[PDB]
Amino acid sequence: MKVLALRHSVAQVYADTQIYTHDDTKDSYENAFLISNLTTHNILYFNYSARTLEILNKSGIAAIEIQSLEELFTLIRCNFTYDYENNVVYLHDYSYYTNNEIRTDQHWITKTNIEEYLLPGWKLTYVGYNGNDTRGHYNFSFTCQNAATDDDIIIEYIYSEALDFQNFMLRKIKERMTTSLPIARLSNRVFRDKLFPLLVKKHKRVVNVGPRNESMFTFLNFPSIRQFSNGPYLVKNTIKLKQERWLGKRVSQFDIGQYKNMLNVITTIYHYYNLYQEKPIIYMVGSAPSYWIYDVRQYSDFLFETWDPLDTPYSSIHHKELFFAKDIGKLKDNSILYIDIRTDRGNADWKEWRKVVELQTISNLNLAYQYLATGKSKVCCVKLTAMDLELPVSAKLLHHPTTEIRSEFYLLLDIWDVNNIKRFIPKGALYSFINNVITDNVFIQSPFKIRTSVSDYIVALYALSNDFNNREDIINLINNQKQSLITVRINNTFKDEPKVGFKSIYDWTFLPTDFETTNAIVTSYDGCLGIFGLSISLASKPTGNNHLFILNGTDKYYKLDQFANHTGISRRSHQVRFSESATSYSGYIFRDLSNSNFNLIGTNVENSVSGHVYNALIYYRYNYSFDLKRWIYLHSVEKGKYYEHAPIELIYACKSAKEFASLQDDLTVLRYANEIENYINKVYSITYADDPNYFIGIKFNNIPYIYDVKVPHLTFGVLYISDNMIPDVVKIMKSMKQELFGMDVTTSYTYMLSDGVYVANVSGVLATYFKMYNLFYKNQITFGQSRMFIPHITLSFSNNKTVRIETTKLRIKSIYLRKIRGDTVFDMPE
Amino acid sequence: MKVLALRHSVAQVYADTQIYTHDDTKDSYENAFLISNLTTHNILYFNYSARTLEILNKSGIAAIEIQSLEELFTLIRCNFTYDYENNVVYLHDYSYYTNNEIRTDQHWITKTNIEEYLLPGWKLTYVGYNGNDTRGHYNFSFTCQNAATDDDIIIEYIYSEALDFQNFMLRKIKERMTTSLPIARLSNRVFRDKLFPLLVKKHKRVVNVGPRNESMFTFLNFPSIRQFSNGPYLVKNTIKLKQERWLGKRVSQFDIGQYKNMLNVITTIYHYYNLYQEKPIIYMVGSAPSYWIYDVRQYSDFLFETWDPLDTPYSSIHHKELFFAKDIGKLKDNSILYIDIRTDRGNADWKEWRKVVELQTISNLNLAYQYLATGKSKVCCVKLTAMDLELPVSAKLLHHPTTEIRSEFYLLLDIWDVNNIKRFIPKGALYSFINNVITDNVFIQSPFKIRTSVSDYIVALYALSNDFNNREDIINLINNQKQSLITVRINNTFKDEPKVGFKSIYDWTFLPTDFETTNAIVTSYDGCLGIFGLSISLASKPTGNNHLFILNGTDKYYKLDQFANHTGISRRSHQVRFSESATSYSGYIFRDLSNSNFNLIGTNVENSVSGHVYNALIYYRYNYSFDLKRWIYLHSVEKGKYYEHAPIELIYACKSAKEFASLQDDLTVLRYANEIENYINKVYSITYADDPNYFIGIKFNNIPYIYDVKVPHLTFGVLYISDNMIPDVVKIMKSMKQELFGMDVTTSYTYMLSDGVYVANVSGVLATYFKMYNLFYKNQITFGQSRMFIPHITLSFSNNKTVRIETTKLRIKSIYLRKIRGDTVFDMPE
Ligand SMILES: Nc1nc2c(ncn2[C@@H]2O[C@H](COP(=O)(O)O)[C@@H](O)[C@H]2O)c(=O)[nH]1
């Protein structure tokens, strides 16, 4: 929501688009609330309270100080992710195209002949992970960098098997200008990099479910984490494959053999991590260029040993420029070995070269076998070619994207693999694997069993909510797990559809009430981002791939007003109320008509009994960052910290939301409202004195209207009690005697309350009524009725016309407790 | 599917539309199968096997003997439900409109002035329940009657609040001619009337969930049954109602006060039934016309006592023509009392008449109170008017449809109600109830808790599968209940949508694999109808409101071929195969290409390994009457009764169905296939010898083709065993030595099996192969491979052209068992 606070003295004015202006010196939390309810994208903050900036940032709303209006202000007309703890700004902005450049996260790409295939004059410039090397471009009051890169395009080109790069880059850039900004993808890079270190330091055992190739670099420094992904391609599974012949498909114009090498070595690193939770020694044979080491070293320090006749720049120690044949004993006991040996494309016939390469393949495989036969705790990966050969059945198969699909694959072998059953594999099956399979993911770990773990911190970022996963197992995991961070699809669909999908790929959808979590925060990406110290320029759109984030066993659950608060609950409510609606009063109007309070709708903008629940039910697709359930619960057990609202006040908003949904045919909001009302009636064991025996009544000295009944009284309470509780009731009355006479009782008009009932309004007594309802309910005394409480002084049982007077205070003369249908009053304090 | 068997001598021929002809004298069950696979609506059966007619009728397919071709045959060009145990034919046919008549199930309607409001010259003729009095119209070789009535139209008119009957009847009749026949509604009347007596006699405790008003007459004679419906309208729930004034809405042109009276008394009967499981004495005050008694007496004998100054025809004993005031002591102790007292519409002012009626209302209420104060086990229902009055809070409110909505309602009171808290109710609330509520259902029983009951026979005909019901509770009920008959929606939707709905009213949808029932029949309405002795002319259309019927703990589960059999599995398969497909061989072709058997597709119509599973997966929307799961299970434990098919044969069809669904983007069939393959691998613990140590080989004397290898042999088996099991294997071989030499081995052509493999086909050995696979699997010996078994004699490792010869028998010379990679053969029987 991009709130920018600039100095009041330097309150510069320009007509920027979608801007707003706010400033006030009354409270520090309500300035944040009122800012959170502004309707535009950018907000300009002029009294610039540091406290209020911190509150916004905790809520996920980006709030930063602006000191160099000349450049700081103008260079923030784009979205960004703000690390407010370290005061860092990560710009997600593709204006750098005006420099005729493509930006990448990876250094190795700069060494390929990629620039030739770009548009004429274009270059690609390395920017570092999340634009770390761009900090020179921006020298502001804060550290500033541009996290936007074109790496998605390059990776898509590599996996797309289409050849011509010029048109591909051009098409993808034009598309990027035609579609809205990929905020989720770009800010999640920052969130991953900040999140997982905090978890590894802060928690004993961290389990990450379904990592994707995007974060392959994130976990390079954290072997403590146990990863669960899709299964690996085993050799035994090649029995199903139909035999095929050589097929020379070219996928990339520029040589990407280094990307293949890097994905291979990283896959091996993570296999080793999965087996032994420690960082291994890396041994590499071949891999002469080896530039990508740099990109790995940016995330974790590793010890690299290289054997290649050419030079390898970034290696730790290039043990020998000479080739490696029988030097097995140099290899230490806790390590991984990458064997990429290609002798040479000789200038001989292709058949002769094939025999040469086949013999070389057998040599490499035997080298791997000797590597793993001698020593415990090691893993290896070999380059083989497609031929008839006998591989172990449990070995893992790798074919990552390479420049051309030309009869090569890789075999990943642990020590359990070497002495295992070996099977004969024809060249046709291996060719079928090379041609029909491209390895999608470097995480080859066994799938995650969706069971609650008591010693683990489970992290399911975008993996659990899928069409094929068991829904009830997901619900039980979220419900009963301690210490977790799990994400599901939101079900922002009308008609309450239980799945949502794109081109026959579907996801399960959940409402916040579909869970029964005891102690957890159920918020948006904004809320979860704030809980971990980040804020963002751009909120979730109501219709999109929006996810609920659920944090189980968090430090922050009891900080109700601090994290996943009601910031922005009324942003959409206010936009609709002031632009499109029939009247700005429509809300109070509808809420009173929904609770059968139509008897008078006269100036109901004052002292309405409905609550936050109405906007959390109706506009949930916008403000689901609120966590309505925790808000209700924490106010059940004070341990009402700011509000002290009676439960009937919550139930009334529930009923109003149900009627609204039925009018709009919003089936989802109808369910959500019914379920929240159920949760309320579970947390509060509410009772209704629909058949009362006694009542509390207030009597006034003067009555500014013509009255036709003998006794004008305000029925201020109605209750159902046994006689023995009359002292208890009395005590509770005494408990607020001061407060009872303190209230500023006012009346301004008379109206018809029902057929044959003519009453005078009473104002200013309702807050006291709710405090007293809370006290009676806490004391297990049945107080209140099924209907809504309407404070009124009955004037006559006749049908008379409405009369108005100026606000005339009313004065209390006695506050009595009387038995219904008994002329006997059982208490009369003055 | 309307199979009509007529005498072969009188094999009359006419060109009726959608007819077919079948006759054969080879088998009695396969004539039924082949008939069940014919594509048209009507089938003409000429060899007319009584056995085959019985088999069809057990399957749900109507199969009746035709003896009077002149009229029996021609008057069966319409659909019907056939009670084949009693040999009765219930026609559902609206041709009777050509007699200018409307047909009703209820006698009371004939006494109203309804005929005046019909179209000129039209009459309404009573036909009895399911047309019992129409048997005179048809005098055939069987008892015959027309169950079709226009009662749906009349009831809809009564509940529709639209006034003009002439246009309403005309519109509804025209609609009935424009839409297809409501078979489900009409045949379910017959099914209910036959089903529930059988259950009450056959089972101790019967529980019926969610009865609707349609079957209000069905349970009149069965107070043993405990009913669960939607809750009742309690007096205490009127606190929510907004006050209203008199509103004179007219709903019907002809007087329907008798329908109101009948619904009132029947509601009271069922309340009494719910409390005390016995038939009560019926006392009625007022209710002078009382014709509807007749309609009640048609279902159960009752004892009626009437007090009215006018005469009451069908009453048991009209105790007194004189009015009933202080005759309370005549009323017996186990009874119900209906108090419909209206003094008279005097010719005085409406206000004076209002006071008269109000005093009369108080008199009636006090009469009811005195009735219930003296005596245990009684229930009462009173006619009251809208006024201020104090009713008990727990009393039940009835407002059934009446002629005009004019300030009257009814109160249902049990003995618990009389001495209960009483509340003051204004006339406005009662008027609001009269104006805004019409009682939808005479079953006012508490809702059903979806829990398994061990002593109960639960019957959920159309109640459980609804949007708001808990899905997992439904699954657990179906899964774990004994002795039940429950119905759910089928999920015939593509894309696998979990709910289906009409105008924001949705239902849960289930596949047959969504349950894990141990001992139950999961079939169609046709199958369930057959299990209870009925058959039907018209099968379920693939896209419709089609329901799965699940019978838990049934006598019929083990009669695999008798009930819920494979009748009609291939009806749709055959229609598609011969009309639209690219070739009639497409099925065998696709099934072989799906299991990677493309190496040869030459004449695969013979000896294909796929099964029934393919058509139960692909065409489930048509043949879901099959209960594929029970078919698989019962053949798992012989206890293969006709087929003796190996499990791999089932799995192959599963894989073929998965590939087919992916090609058609039929997401539902894809899931169903995956789940059935899972069920197969659960029931059979299958093992694969993908890495074999030994093999079974057959050697032949002559080889009709040119062979380039030293030893021509048929690898007839492949297995993985420890050495110690060689005797066991040998014994099993000996177990079928005779059978092994008995088979008619034939070869007809040579083909290429893979790159560098040239083989000769082998035919006629596959059935023996499957018998032997079953024997090895039963003996816990790992036999077979992950791939499909292809019997072949390898001829050379060279790429040669295909050659064909006439069918040349091959002769076995020895059947040996040899260790793989060992020249050592370990057995050689001749
Ligand atoms: N009864 C009640 N009303 C609230 C509460 N919070 C905000 N409101 C009402 O909601 C209004 C803003 O939201 P809107 O009605 O515009 O959606 C405020 O002017 C205020 O009257 C609450 O906690 N209880």
Ligand SMILES: Nc1nc2c(ncn2[C@@H]2O[C@H](COP(=O)(O)O)[C@@H](O)[C@H]2O)c(=O)[nH]1
């Ligand atoms: N393998 C196998 N094929 C069957 C079985 N039952 C029917 N079929 C095949 O299915 C054909 C009829 O079904 P269709 O292929 O036309 O859908 C028959 O001609 C027969 O070849 C069975 O149990 N196993």
